[PDB]
Structure 1
Amino acid sequence: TYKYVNLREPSMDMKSVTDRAAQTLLWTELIRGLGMTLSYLFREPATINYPFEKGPLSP
């Protein structure tokens, strides 16, 4: 069937521009999003120590 993605007209009123004005000017974007999704560093590194450890196979 259908789906129309990335197809949405803007708000264009008094208050909702302040959500798009604080975004560009003071960067509430790009740090709450992209500075937190990188860190996300505390997870365990899933590395195989190849001369000692070995991975799975199949019969």
Structure 2
Amino acid sequence: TYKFVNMREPSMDMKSVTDRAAQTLLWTELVRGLGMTLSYLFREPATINYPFEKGPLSP
């Protein structure tokens, strides 16, 4: 049982062509990555205050 990861064909209609041209010229996916980093900026960090706080351990 297997699946393909890179076997998809782009749509060749005028709307899809114009959308791809807008992506190429206006950098939509780059803004998407910027949005991901901006979203992370507003989260609470995972850092603890060593040595005043310690990492969890087990018996």
| TM-score interval (norm. to shorter) | 0.7 to 0.9
My pick for the range that moved more, 15-24 or 31-40, is 31-40
Compute the displacement of 1:58 (Å).
0.5
Percent identity over the alignment?
Answer: 95
Kindly tell me the number of residue pairs found equivalent between the two proteins: 59
Structure 1 length-normalised TM: 0.75
Structure 2 length-normalised TM: 0.75
Compute the displacement of 1:34 (Å).
3.2
When the two chains are superposed, the root-mean-square deviation of aligned CA atoms in Å is 1.7
- Unaligned 5+ segments in structure 1 are none
Off by >4 Å, runs of 4+ in structure 1: none
Task: Output the CA distance in 1 between the equivalents of 2:2 and 2:36.
Answer: 34
Compute the displacement of 1:46 (Å).
2.0
Compute the displacement of 1:57 (Å).
0.8
- Unaligned 5+ segments in structure 2 are none
Structure (1 or 2) with the greater helix fraction:
2
